[PDB]
Symmetry: C3
Subunit: 67 residues, 3 copies
């Protein structure tokens, strides 16, 4: 060998470990992006459900006055 060759090969191994660790981070952030896409849809749906209920309550308020 040679001390320089050793250091080079150990550097490659350290880099490979870092890649594996970053790869796990990549999967974690991907779950985060899916969760976020879902939040966006859930909020939209909740917003529509409340507008539906608001409309129904307006109708009842109007019906209440009439009666």
């Amino acid at each position: 060998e040679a001390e320089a060759e050793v250091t080079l090969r150990e550097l490659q191994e350290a880099l490979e470990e870092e890649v594996l660790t970053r790869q796990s981070l990549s999967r974690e952030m991907e779950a985060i992006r899916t969760d976020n896409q879902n939040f966006a849809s859930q909020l939209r749906e909740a917003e529509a459900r409340n507008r539906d209920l608001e409309a129904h309550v307006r109708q009842l308020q109007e019906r209440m006055e009439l009666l």
Copy 2:
């Protein structure tokens, strides 16, 4: 055996991939702040609607009475 330049290239490509992740994380934080605000808006519109429904229940009690 890996060479200096091959290691250098592999490191630069790892740095690029991670830099892409770092940029994505900016879009995530953006979204999170916006979603928090949207949730507070929804919470308030529901609290408002609760109060109207409570008032309707009270009006109905008065009319029944």
Copy 3:
């Protein structure tokens, strides 16, 4: 020109940066969980209110 020394240092710097990113991800994973719990609570309150509205509608129709 590129030395083994410069590459070792460049990897250490990249490790530091990537570790800081991992912390941020950790903080957001926790955050997103607390958020989803708040969102489900809001969904539950709206479902409860829907039930109360139905009962009002039905009482109103009795008179």
